[PDB]
Amino acid sequence: MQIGKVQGRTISEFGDPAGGLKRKISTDGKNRKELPAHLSSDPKALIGQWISGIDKIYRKPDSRPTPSKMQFDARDDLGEAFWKLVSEAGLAQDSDYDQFKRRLHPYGDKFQPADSGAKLKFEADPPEPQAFHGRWYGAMSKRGNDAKELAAALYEHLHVDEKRIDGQPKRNPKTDKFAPGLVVARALGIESSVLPRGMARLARNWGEEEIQTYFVVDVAASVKEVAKAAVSAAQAFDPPRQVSGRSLSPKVGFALAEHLERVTGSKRCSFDPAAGPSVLALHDEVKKTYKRLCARGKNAARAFPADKTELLALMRHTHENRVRNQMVRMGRVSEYRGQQAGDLAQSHYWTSAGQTEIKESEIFVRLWVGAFALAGRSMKAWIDPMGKINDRDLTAAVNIRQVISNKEMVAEAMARRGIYFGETPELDRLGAEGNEGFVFALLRYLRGCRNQTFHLGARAGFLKEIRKELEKTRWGKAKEAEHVVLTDKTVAAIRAIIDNDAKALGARLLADLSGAFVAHYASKEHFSTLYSEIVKAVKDAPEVSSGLPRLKLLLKRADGVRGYVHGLRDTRKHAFATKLPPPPAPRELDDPATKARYIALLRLYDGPFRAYASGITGTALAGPAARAKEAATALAQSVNVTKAYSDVMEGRTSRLRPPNDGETLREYLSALTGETATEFRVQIGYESDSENARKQAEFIENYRRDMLAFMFEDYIRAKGFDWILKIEPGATAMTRAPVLPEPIDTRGQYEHWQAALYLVMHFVPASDVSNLLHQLRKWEALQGKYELVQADARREALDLVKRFRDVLVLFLKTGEARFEGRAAPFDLKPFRALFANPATFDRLFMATASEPELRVARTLRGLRQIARYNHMAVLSDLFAKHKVRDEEVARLAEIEDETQEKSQIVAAQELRTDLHDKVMKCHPKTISPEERQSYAAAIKTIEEHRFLVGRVYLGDHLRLHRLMMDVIGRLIDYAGAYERDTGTFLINASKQLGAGADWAVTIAGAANTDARTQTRKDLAHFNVLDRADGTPDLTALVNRAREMMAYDRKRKNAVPRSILDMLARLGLTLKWQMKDHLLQDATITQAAIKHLDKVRLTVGGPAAVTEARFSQDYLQMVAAVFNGSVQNPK
RNA sequence: AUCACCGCCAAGACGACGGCGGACUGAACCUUCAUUACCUCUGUUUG
């Protein structure tokens, strides 16, 4: 929360004797504190609210700073006087006086006169003191102007009797109870900020009769003129000032009051809602409507309706939206409640903990629905690539009947299967009848995964539904259509695949380490212990934490912190450095020692460390947490040492609560995720740029990296893996030909449903499998979930979840085992079209360890994924438009030509790093024109190399395909929300209401149209990609998706932002124009990477050199799939 | 559309023309992979 910068989270629970939700504050994740009590007594929160109160009487300098002496003295006088009051009030301790003064004067407390010419210097006094008067100066100065009097008024306002901004008391009660000050009033307002459980406050308390009276004169058009007049005045300044909604708010409020007076003869708004419809109910809703419009950060004025017609339409749509938001909320709670025990109104899922539980479940569902949409697309290409089979679902009874009846189709599918399964001797000798059973089963296993409306819960009912479908080896009946019985062989073949992959795991894990030279850089005892630990973590494991960062990023952070502290004279700060190695650049992995160290570290981190760290508590957790905080504080004080109050500065990490005693790392990492969600929203408020928001919110992620870096180092030392850290780059092997240990048995005991699920996973990309395990881990890590008080209920639940996890892990650890060192299991001939000369494609990618070899393998795996979906039909035209020419191949060769001498690219790369470090080490602020010219020249060669590699090895083509899939994937995710909100939650909601609120049911029902449901289907089944000729239009898709999500404005509005932000993350800059409610005129450019940012030429001027990430060829491709064009700035 | 969206604090008199909450709500963030990979390191307070 923001209020007074008070620390802690808010929780909503039941317990109140009224039987309703109440919001409390928790400081350690466990305790519960009442808002009025806390916000009236907490030192930090009090001081925060006091200074906020002072800031509205006398403003501090704008920061979006340096005050005048007049301004400074004014703030100081008021501060001192107010301090004296609250001190004597017994609200303020002497201990906290310094904090109060630091926060009264955040700009600093030591300045020389304004005409002095000193380092720290006041601004010249303004011509009028009113320059720094705030909105509340008038109200607080009614009983005089002196500091003593301003302070007295502020104190009364905050702690005794709340005033309006005009200086009048807000409340004049006649009862036994005195009216509160602002602090308590606002705190009570927070206390009752809880989810509505019913429809009471959604009824519209006015109609046509009220409209006739109220809109005799068009208030909306006149308010619109207020907005235009506000715009013009701000636009009249030489620097064009933009008007915010917060500045418009008072002008609209006055205009609306004058309107009420015109209608009623009075400005008194107080009305009687219970008495029935009224003009003042309508007015209250008009005020609320403009309150919403004025809360907008961007272009508030532009959104103002121009007309009574527009205003009433906005009010209607907003009302319709709020009803559907409330009905989705209710229907979701009910769905998660089920039967349980309790009284829908008292359900755990109304609470903050319960809503967090819902959120992580819902996200798992999205990922699940998403993974099996891709599976569907994969199975389509497997079975019916040319669409020989208006239901577009191959698993539907009508279509699956056609598949099995077609003998050639089934046979051709079995012959193509290698692209999905790899080499599968297990499936070779089923026979034609056996094959038909097998193709049928996988379609039914897909359907069993895909046709689930489910959620996560303590019973693991979801996995039970999965098991019910996937344990089947027979379907239907003999007397009726679709009788399929799997043959004993077909069954054994299904069960054998997962069995053999498991059996093979031990030796694969050994070979992985062996092939990365790990056994060459470790004693036999050390290597043996490492290998044993890795296999043990995969074979027998509890549900671990996915909260761990990626090792590379952890290592990057550790490297960055090490680098800074090692540059400081104060050696005490060197303590915050680890001996963890830097992250390797890809080229550095060519060095055996470097590979060995990184792979050993990577496998250790992901498996044995993750297993160990997840359940850790006490000193092993608290030690690294504290150290991470100490480090951030040390870093902050060093960087900003010159700035004010530097000796008391703490890292922003210090706001975060320490781990509780008995809390596991898994639990503390999950709590931290809550902080991140909150921090991103807060940052988006200060700046709406998603990437700048991420930078300002990154301190949380950097705390986790620092904390985990210290834990990882500690673990390495504690378990005797120090040797890994001691391997130095370029070191020659300890043993030239080491004797490896025996492979450990990795055999498992798998149920049929696991084997079935495992085979369906072969139609889902590995990344999406990984995402499923990551979310499963996140959901399992969640504290405060609904549980059972049924003793063995949790034992069965835990068995299902463990078996599910084993399927995912085995799939991931097996990776390319059935593909490696074998020919491409698909036709490469269609991909010749991507080259001008087909012979050139053949020479490069059609076979007749090294770095060129790894690159060819990467490309072929890329093409495989396109073939897996049968997507050459979708992007053949576009790809063939951007054919790779022989001159590009030749140019790339000569740039990389290493046979005679240092190749062009290697020379360029080394010159660039050489110069960068020379600048950043010897003089980070400066660079000579000649140094800068060679730097630019190096970048140019580097760019040319990147662009040619991107074309010759088809990087551009594969990135375009991936981008396309990601965009459509994001829209499919929205489609899942449509299906689920409308098909489940709203239906549930409508049934609770019954005949009481038919108006709400008609509004719920409005969520659906034929076109929206069609868009849901077309997205789900990639029907938008089903065009033999031409390129897909993603702009039109986004527009269809916007319309699909119209039932929920927050989603409809977010649809385009999702896609923009997705591209931005990659450095692609997309822009649309909105005309007639449709996105259009898509343009594409890129964000250049800025080298030598704050570095100046020795001769003067910015020394900045810019690097392009992407070729014009790729930008053109991206533009084409958005039916747009490239527009690079000049 | 491109930070929105939902909700809370009612009046003894002319206003809420002011204050707020929000893992609570979408959007983000985080993420198995010897991937394309490039931006010195590091970051208080305000906002």
mmCIF file of C-alpha atoms in Angstrom, chain A residues 501-691:
data_model
loop_
_atom_site.group_PDB
_atom_site.id
_atom_site.type_symbol
_atom_site.label_atom_id
_atom_site.label_comp_id
_atom_site.label_asym_id
_atom_site.label_seq_id
_atom_site.Cartn_x
_atom_site.Cartn_y
_atom_site.Cartn_z
ATOM 1 C CA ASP A 501 12.901 -43.362 -21.684
ATOM 2 C CA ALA A 502 13.000 -43.797 -17.889
ATOM 3 C CA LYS A 503 15.324 -46.842 -18.128
ATOM 4 C CA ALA A 504 17.599 -44.816 -20.446
ATOM 5 C CA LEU A 505 17.721 -41.717 -18.198
ATOM 6 C CA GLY A 506 20.627 -42.759 -15.971
ATOM 7 C CA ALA A 507 23.079 -43.167 -18.866
ATOM 8 C CA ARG A 508 21.781 -40.007 -20.662
ATOM 9 C CA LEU A 509 22.526 -37.961 -17.500
ATOM 10 C CA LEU A 510 25.994 -39.519 -17.304
ATOM 11 C CA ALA A 511 26.643 -38.856 -21.023
ATOM 12 C CA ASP A 512 25.437 -35.247 -20.605
ATOM 13 C CA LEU A 513 28.120 -34.590 -17.960
ATOM 14 C CA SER A 514 30.726 -36.695 -19.828
ATOM 15 C CA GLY A 515 30.118 -34.890 -23.140
ATOM 16 C CA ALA A 516 30.510 -31.506 -21.398
ATOM 17 C CA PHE A 517 34.021 -32.623 -20.231
ATOM 18 C CA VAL A 518 32.966 -32.638 -16.559
ATOM 19 C CA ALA A 519 34.787 -35.928 -15.790
ATOM 20 C CA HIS A 520 37.980 -34.405 -17.286
ATOM 21 C CA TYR A 521 38.020 -31.543 -14.670
ATOM 22 C CA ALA A 522 37.055 -33.517 -11.521
ATOM 23 C CA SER A 523 38.529 -36.288 -9.371
ATOM 24 C CA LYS A 524 36.754 -39.631 -9.783
ATOM 25 C CA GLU A 525 35.322 -39.315 -6.257
ATOM 26 C CA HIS A 526 34.056 -35.756 -6.911
ATOM 27 C CA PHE A 527 32.529 -36.648 -10.303
ATOM 28 C CA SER A 528 30.877 -39.757 -8.855
ATOM 29 C CA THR A 529 29.281 -37.755 -5.994
ATOM 30 C CA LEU A 530 28.038 -35.082 -8.463
ATOM 31 C CA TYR A 531 26.527 -37.705 -10.832
ATOM 32 C CA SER A 532 24.882 -39.610 -7.948
ATOM 33 C CA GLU A 533 23.228 -36.441 -6.558
ATOM 34 C CA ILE A 534 21.879 -35.421 -10.007
ATOM 35 C CA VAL A 535 20.228 -38.852 -10.629
ATOM 36 C CA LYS A 536 18.843 -38.963 -7.045
ATOM 37 C CA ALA A 537 17.130 -35.561 -7.531
ATOM 38 C CA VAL A 538 15.427 -36.687 -10.805
ATOM 39 C CA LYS A 539 14.527 -40.229 -9.571
ATOM 40 C CA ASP A 540 13.052 -39.416 -6.123
ATOM 41 C CA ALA A 541 11.841 -35.867 -5.456
ATOM 42 C CA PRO A 542 9.175 -33.837 -3.585
ATOM 43 C CA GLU A 543 7.498 -30.831 -5.336
ATOM 44 C CA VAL A 544 10.340 -28.248 -5.535
ATOM 45 C CA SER A 545 10.309 -24.424 -5.902
ATOM 46 C CA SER A 546 10.188 -22.924 -9.424
ATOM 47 C CA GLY A 547 10.811 -19.537 -7.749
ATOM 48 C CA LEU A 548 14.534 -20.035 -8.445
ATOM 49 C CA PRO A 549 15.854 -17.616 -11.141
ATOM 50 C CA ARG A 550 17.673 -18.837 -14.284
ATOM 51 C CA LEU A 551 21.274 -19.651 -13.349
ATOM 52 C CA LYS A 552 22.588 -17.291 -16.083
ATOM 53 C CA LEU A 553 20.657 -14.346 -14.622
ATOM 54 C CA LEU A 554 21.629 -15.279 -11.055
ATOM 55 C CA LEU A 555 25.278 -15.409 -12.209
ATOM 56 C CA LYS A 556 24.927 -12.109 -14.121
ATOM 57 C CA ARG A 557 23.633 -10.333 -10.947
ATOM 58 C CA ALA A 558 26.397 -11.891 -8.789
ATOM 59 C CA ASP A 559 28.942 -10.773 -11.413
ATOM 60 C CA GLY A 560 27.536 -7.220 -11.436
ATOM 61 C CA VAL A 561 27.597 -6.902 -7.647
ATOM 62 C CA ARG A 562 31.101 -8.480 -7.385
ATOM 63 C CA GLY A 563 32.347 -6.025 -10.045
ATOM 64 C CA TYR A 564 31.021 -2.945 -8.176
ATOM 65 C CA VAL A 565 32.191 -3.843 -4.631
ATOM 66 C CA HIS A 566 35.659 -4.910 -5.921
ATOM 67 C CA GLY A 567 35.989 -1.393 -7.383
ATOM 68 C CA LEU A 568 35.555 0.153 -3.896
ATOM 69 C CA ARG A 569 38.414 1.093 -1.492
ATOM 70 C CA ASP A 570 36.335 -0.062 1.514
ATOM 71 C CA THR A 571 37.274 -3.774 1.702
ATOM 72 C CA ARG A 572 34.396 -4.536 4.176
ATOM 73 C CA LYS A 573 32.041 -4.348 1.143
ATOM 74 C CA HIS A 574 34.033 -7.044 -0.726
ATOM 75 C CA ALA A 575 32.283 -9.507 1.636
ATOM 76 C CA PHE A 576 29.152 -9.242 -0.573
ATOM 77 C CA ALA A 577 31.019 -10.754 -3.571
ATOM 78 C CA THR A 578 30.699 -14.499 -4.267
ATOM 79 C CA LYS A 579 33.215 -16.802 -5.976
ATOM 80 C CA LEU A 580 30.438 -17.938 -8.344
ATOM 81 C CA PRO A 581 31.654 -17.749 -11.987
ATOM 82 C CA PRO A 582 30.367 -15.119 -14.470
ATOM 83 C CA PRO A 583 27.694 -16.254 -16.984
ATOM 84 C CA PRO A 584 29.408 -17.770 -20.080
ATOM 85 C CA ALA A 585 28.932 -16.117 -23.485
ATOM 86 C CA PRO A 586 28.125 -18.823 -26.114
ATOM 87 C CA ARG A 587 31.643 -18.571 -27.742
ATOM 88 C CA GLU A 588 33.242 -19.159 -24.287
ATOM 89 C CA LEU A 589 31.616 -22.623 -24.067
ATOM 90 C CA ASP A 590 34.029 -23.748 -26.830
ATOM 91 C CA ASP A 591 36.634 -23.832 -24.033
ATOM 92 C CA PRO A 592 36.402 -27.308 -22.369
ATOM 93 C CA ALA A 593 37.049 -26.071 -18.789
ATOM 94 C CA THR A 594 34.403 -23.341 -19.129
ATOM 95 C CA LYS A 595 31.823 -25.825 -20.486
ATOM 96 C CA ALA A 596 32.606 -28.354 -17.728
ATOM 97 C CA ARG A 597 32.232 -25.724 -14.946
ATOM 98 C CA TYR A 598 28.950 -24.210 -16.345
ATOM 99 C CA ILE A 599 27.230 -27.562 -17.093
ATOM 100 C CA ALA A 600 28.256 -29.039 -13.729
ATOM 101 C CA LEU A 601 26.913 -25.857 -12.084
ATOM 102 C CA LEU A 602 23.730 -25.814 -14.211
ATOM 103 C CA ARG A 603 22.778 -29.487 -13.496
ATOM 104 C CA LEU A 604 23.676 -29.039 -9.801
ATOM 105 C CA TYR A 605 21.493 -25.866 -9.575
ATOM 106 C CA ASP A 606 18.399 -27.273 -11.365
ATOM 107 C CA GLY A 607 18.379 -30.655 -9.589
ATOM 108 C CA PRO A 608 20.192 -31.269 -6.236
ATOM 109 C CA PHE A 609 20.389 -27.591 -5.167
ATOM 110 C CA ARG A 610 16.699 -26.939 -6.103
ATOM 111 C CA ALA A 611 15.616 -30.057 -4.136
ATOM 112 C CA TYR A 612 17.733 -29.005 -1.074
ATOM 113 C CA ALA A 613 17.013 -25.234 -1.129
ATOM 114 C CA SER A 614 13.220 -25.498 -1.544
ATOM 115 C CA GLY A 615 12.461 -26.923 1.913
ATOM 116 C CA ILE A 616 15.266 -25.022 3.706
ATOM 117 C CA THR A 617 14.387 -22.951 6.800
ATOM 118 C CA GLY A 618 16.146 -21.069 9.594
ATOM 119 C CA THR A 619 19.729 -19.793 9.426
ATOM 120 C CA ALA A 620 20.302 -21.243 5.942
ATOM 121 C CA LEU A 621 17.427 -19.062 4.624
ATOM 122 C CA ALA A 622 17.601 -16.035 6.965
ATOM 123 C CA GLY A 623 21.387 -15.666 6.598
ATOM 124 C CA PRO A 624 21.348 -15.155 2.784
ATOM 125 C CA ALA A 625 18.150 -13.016 3.000
ATOM 126 C CA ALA A 626 19.749 -10.612 5.509
ATOM 127 C CA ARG A 627 23.056 -10.572 3.562
ATOM 128 C CA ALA A 628 21.157 -9.705 0.349
ATOM 129 C CA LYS A 629 19.558 -6.748 2.207
ATOM 130 C CA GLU A 630 22.893 -5.641 3.705
ATOM 131 C CA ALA A 631 24.408 -5.783 0.199
ATOM 132 C CA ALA A 632 21.650 -3.625 -1.352
ATOM 133 C CA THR A 633 22.033 -1.098 1.505
ATOM 134 C CA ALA A 634 25.838 -1.074 1.027
ATOM 135 C CA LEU A 635 25.405 -0.602 -2.739
ATOM 136 C CA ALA A 636 22.871 2.239 -2.338
ATOM 137 C CA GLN A 637 25.060 4.153 0.164
ATOM 138 C CA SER A 638 28.142 3.821 -2.072
ATOM 139 C CA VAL A 639 26.401 5.001 -5.272
ATOM 140 C CA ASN A 640 24.530 7.950 -3.692
ATOM 141 C CA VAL A 641 27.148 8.887 -1.055
ATOM 142 C CA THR A 642 27.164 12.555 -2.173
ATOM 143 C CA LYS A 643 23.344 12.846 -1.912
ATOM 144 C CA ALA A 644 21.374 13.882 1.196
ATOM 145 C CA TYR A 645 21.006 11.527 4.226
ATOM 146 C CA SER A 646 23.303 8.934 2.562
ATOM 147 C CA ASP A 647 24.441 7.491 5.929
ATOM 148 C CA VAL A 648 20.854 6.276 6.660
ATOM 149 C CA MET A 649 19.982 5.110 3.126
ATOM 150 C CA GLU A 650 18.758 1.526 2.751
ATOM 151 C CA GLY A 651 18.205 -0.579 -0.368
ATOM 152 C CA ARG A 652 14.551 -0.705 -1.553
ATOM 153 C CA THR A 653 14.816 -4.420 -0.693
ATOM 154 C CA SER A 654 14.713 -3.347 2.994
ATOM 155 C CA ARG A 655 10.911 -2.644 2.625
ATOM 156 C CA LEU A 656 10.461 -6.426 2.074
ATOM 157 C CA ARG A 657 9.764 -8.521 5.219
ATOM 158 C CA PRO A 658 12.414 -11.100 6.296
ATOM 159 C CA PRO A 659 11.599 -14.853 6.192
ATOM 160 C CA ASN A 660 9.481 -16.062 9.152
ATOM 161 C CA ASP A 661 10.839 -18.760 11.485
ATOM 162 C CA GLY A 662 9.701 -22.087 10.003
ATOM 163 C CA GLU A 663 8.962 -20.558 6.584
ATOM 164 C CA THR A 664 10.601 -22.448 3.721
ATOM 165 C CA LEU A 665 12.442 -20.832 0.799
ATOM 166 C CA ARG A 666 9.623 -22.149 -1.453
ATOM 167 C CA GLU A 667 7.089 -20.283 0.726
ATOM 168 C CA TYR A 668 9.128 -17.029 0.965
ATOM 169 C CA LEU A 669 9.760 -16.989 -2.840
ATOM 170 C CA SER A 670 5.990 -17.347 -3.432
ATOM 171 C CA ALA A 671 5.217 -14.485 -1.044
ATOM 172 C CA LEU A 672 7.776 -12.359 -2.917
ATOM 173 C CA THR A 673 5.792 -12.893 -6.145
ATOM 174 C CA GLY A 674 2.902 -11.063 -4.446
ATOM 175 C CA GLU A 675 5.214 -8.087 -3.844
ATOM 176 C CA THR A 676 6.198 -8.080 -7.537
ATOM 177 C CA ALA A 677 2.593 -8.011 -8.795
ATOM 178 C CA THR A 678 2.058 -4.998 -6.484
ATOM 179 C CA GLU A 679 5.292 -3.239 -7.449
ATOM 180 C CA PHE A 680 4.622 -3.468 -11.222
ATOM 181 C CA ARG A 681 1.153 -1.845 -10.819
ATOM 182 C CA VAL A 682 2.730 0.900 -8.669
ATOM 183 C CA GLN A 683 5.445 1.528 -11.292
ATOM 184 C CA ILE A 684 2.938 1.527 -14.193
ATOM 185 C CA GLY A 685 1.215 4.337 -12.265
ATOM 186 C CA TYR A 686 4.399 6.482 -12.031
ATOM 187 C CA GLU A 687 5.314 5.682 -15.709
ATOM 188 C CA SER A 688 3.082 3.761 -18.134
ATOM 189 C CA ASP A 689 6.000 2.347 -20.164
ATOM 190 C CA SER A 690 6.048 -1.419 -19.415
ATOM 191 C CA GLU A 691 9.841 -1.730 -19.923
#
